[PDB]
Design a protein around this ligand. Structure first.
Ligand SMILES: Nc1ncnc2c1ncn2[C@@H]1O[C@H](COP(=O)(O)OP(=O)(O)OP(=O)(O)O)[C@@H](O)[C@H]1O
Lengths: 594, 79, 58
């Protein structure tokens, strides 16, 4: 080699200053991993090269990485790995790259493919909805002649080295090397690696309205597997790559593409438009405003900046969204610790308004639109044969709902077959199915939010308040709060409405999403004899007043009456169940029932 | 170790690991997929009439109390 | 054969373990005589076909 190797070596003296700040980093990450492994009685080989250390002072070496990314990366690895041993060889796995930074206009939205940069560096974002299997793969197996005690060596190359199209080895395992010895193979010293494909859709808001979402796929490696839950705003970066013989491997080859698009990439990141690290400053201010004894009320009014009133509804949403705990019974069935509120109202009274903006601040809680095909909580045994001999129970809609919220619409405008499914997932946290395959109890922590409409217009007052939708009481008994939104007409009421819609055709949100997601990590009190003494008195008088009046209540309603106040103390961020929480819990039900 | 497992056994197996070749349609498909299994070595199963049990049959005979203590015995978790 | 058929010399061989199983003869006298040899007699007379070579005896 002298021409193709010279600017390697000139870089081999160049980039060693481009890890003046990382040559500490790459050895500090292993010296304790070498230490703790010797005193057990763990991290991969990630070497994040920024742009900044390779753009401030190298230009010929720079643009080679963004024009021809095929003669440069295995140079960068081979010159990396000697520094692993030249730093660390006394105690007795190739350290590939990641390359974070910016890029300067390669945010190819994959609705667009490129004519300029094929076989180059690409930055891609979107959502994944495939999540295929996991399967290991060999790279190097070592053979051993059991007679004469001598060893052997063999490496298999594949379409996995990411860059060099070597002569493949169309072989699985050889036998009988040039001797009369029956070949033995040591599998502890044979190395493996995994292999997982995933398809990425289009972020369906920035693709303009002329098409359905498109998709491509990406092969990643072990370092960031099981990181990709289906429904994450992911952002990957890798090389663009074609493989496969198009036009010769079969004869006459008419109308068959033979150039599959692939991405053999690295370093995914979740984004947000779970990881939000805050400093000492904002963590102290949120304690400083915690000292105020009004902030439960301020958060109610600072949520929906368009609509008047409904402060009973507005406190309920933030009470539900933050969530109440479920303490599992030891060697016993745990109870309902989910909360599940419901609405109904005569039309155009903002029943669906506030239902869509809970999805923006959802904190990884992606909901459906309530279109009630069978698949709302199940699998329907969709396997697609998974490359000839693998059957997979593909996750329909509960792998996204776990420790999150959902919302569905149009209950009475549904068939029967969804209603039997919402029976099971409410009485029990899990679904278990055996369609043409395996019985499997997979767990789910869900919390529905409902929206239906009454049937006969404005007939609520002149008839019974109950049966007003007459969907089965299997769900009404499994739900707690049936807010009936009024629309009464008062000349000061509507006049106030008329300007407030008009004033908006022309205490903050990201602080709000931090406060709740910090409050999911604080301890749960549950324990004060004072607060439990007053609520049962508060129950008994309405236990005299439920049956001689509107609506009969049951024992599970008491498990609400702990749970609302339990979450109400989670707003307080304290470990003492106070007295003041028990007054808002009683008063909220009093409007919900009267 | 055969004939010693059951559907529904909350158990654990200890055993040794090896992958296996596929030897079918290995060129077009089946490039270097592996589809391993594990090979078993040991099973440590868990949570399983006048034969050293008569002492507790006497505890009902000596104490008596059929109509009420046994009534409080099954399902004492209601009102 | 050429092209990287031989490997590096590994310090972990098998002949050093082969003779170390030869000193798994009658020598373990802590646990009525050689106890793992006592189980060897209750198989040859054909009533049970599973020896147990644990790590406790190692
Ligand atoms: N009670 C209300 N107060 C203030 N604005 C309202 C109210 N109801 C509706 N609006 C205005 O009307 C617009 C749309 O209301 P929306 O379509 O959500 O009614 P809805 O809840 O969907 O009723 P339905 O589900 O029966 O159609 C919103 O932009 C909102 O500003």
């Amino acid at each position: 080699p002298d021409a193709v190797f010279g600017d390697r070596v000139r870089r081999f003296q160049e980039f060693l200053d481009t890890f003046t700040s990382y040559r500490d980093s790459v050895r500090s990450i292993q010296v304790y991993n070498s230490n703790n492994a010797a005193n057990y009685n763990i991290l991969p080989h990630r070497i994040i090269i920024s742009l900044d250390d390779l753009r401030e002072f190298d230009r010929s070496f720079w643009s080679g990485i963004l024009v021809e990314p095929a003669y440069f990366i295995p140079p960068a690895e081979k010159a990396l790995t000697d520094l692993a041993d030249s730093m660390d060889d006394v105690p007795h796995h190739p350290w590939k790259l990641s390359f974070k930074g910016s890029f300067g206009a390669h945010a190819l939205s994959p609705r667009t493919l490129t004519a300029q940069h094929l076989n180059k560096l690409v930055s891609v974002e979107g959502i994944v909805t495939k999540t295929s299997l996991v399967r290991p793969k060999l790279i190097r197996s070592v053979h051993y002649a059991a007679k004469t005690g001598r060893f052997h060596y063999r490496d298999y190359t594949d379409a996995t080295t990411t860059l060099t199209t070597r002569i493949p080895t169309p072989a699985i395992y050889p036998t009988e090397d040039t001797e009369g010895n029956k070949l033995t193979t040591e599998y502890g010293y044979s190395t493996f690696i995994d292999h997982q494909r995933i398809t990425v859709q289009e972020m369906p808001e920035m693709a303009p309205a002329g098409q359905l979402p498109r998709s491509i796929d990406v092969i990643l490696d072990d370092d960031l597997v099981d990181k990709t839950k289906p429904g994450d705003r992911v952002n990957v970066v890798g090389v663009f790559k074609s493989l496969g013989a198009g036009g010769m491997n079969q004869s006459n080859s008419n109308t068959l593409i033979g150039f599959k698009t692939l991405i053999l990439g690295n370093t995914v990141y979740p984004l947000h438009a779970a990881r939000q690290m805050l400093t000492d400053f904002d963590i102290r201010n949120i304690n400083k405003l915690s000292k105020k004894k009004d902030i439960f009320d301020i958060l109610s009014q600072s949520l929906a900046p368009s609509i008047y009133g409904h402060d009973h509804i507005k406190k309920a949403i933030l009470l539900m969204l933050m969530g109440g705990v479920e303490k599992n019974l030891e060697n016993g069935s745990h109870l309902r610790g989910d909360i599940n509120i419901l609405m109904v109202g005569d039309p155009s009274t903002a029943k669906s308004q506030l239902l869509r903006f809970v999805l923006n601040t959802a904190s990884l809680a992606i909901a459906t639109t309530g279109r009630g095909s069978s698949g709302v909580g199940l699998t329907a045994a969709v396997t697609t044969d998974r490359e000839t001999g693998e059957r997979r129970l593909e996750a329909g809609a509960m792998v996204l709902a776990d420790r999150g919220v959902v919302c569905i619409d149009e209950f009475d405008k549904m068939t029967d077959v969804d209603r039997v499914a919402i029976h099971e997932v409410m009485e029990q946290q899990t679904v278990t199915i055996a369609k043409a395959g395996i019985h499997t109890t997979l767990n789910a922590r869900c919390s529905v939010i409902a929206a239906a409409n009454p049937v006969f217009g404005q007939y609520d007052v002149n008839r019974d308040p109950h049966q007003n939708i007459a969907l089965p009481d299997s769900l009404l008994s499994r739900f707690d709060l049936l807010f009936v939104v009024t629309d009464d007409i008062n000349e000061i009421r509507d006049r106030s409405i008329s300007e407030h819609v008009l004033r908006t055709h022309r205490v903050t949100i990201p602080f709000l999403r931090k406060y709740v997601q910090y409050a999911k990590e604080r301890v749960i009190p549950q324990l004060t004899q004072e607060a439990i003494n007053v609520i049962v008195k508060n129950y008994t008088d309405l236990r005299n007043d439920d049956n001689t009046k509107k609506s009969p209540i049951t024992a599970r309603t008491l498990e609400t009456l702990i749970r609302l106040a339990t979450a109400h103390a989670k707003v307080r961020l304290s470990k003492t169940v106070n007295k003041v929480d028990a007054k808002v819990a009683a008063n909220l039900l009093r409007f919900a029932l009267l | 170790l055969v004939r010693s497992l059951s559907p529904g056994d909350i158990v654990d197996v200890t055993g040794i690991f090896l992958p296996a070749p596929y030897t079918g349609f290995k060129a077009l498909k089946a490039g270097l997929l592996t589809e391993t299994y594990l090979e078993a070595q040991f099973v440590r199963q868990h949570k399983k009439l006048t034969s050293d049990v008569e002492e507790r049959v006497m505890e009902l005979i000596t104490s008596g109390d059929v109509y009420n203590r046994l009534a409080k015995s099954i399902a004492p978790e209601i009102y | 054969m050429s092209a990287a058929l031989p490997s590096i010399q590994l310090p972990v061989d098998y002949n050093n373990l082969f003779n170390e199983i030869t000193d798994f003869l009658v020598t373990f006298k802590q646990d009525k005589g050689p106890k793992y040899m006592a189980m060897l007699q209750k198989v040859a007379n054909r009533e049970l076909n599973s020896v147990i070579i644990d790590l406790d005896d190692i």
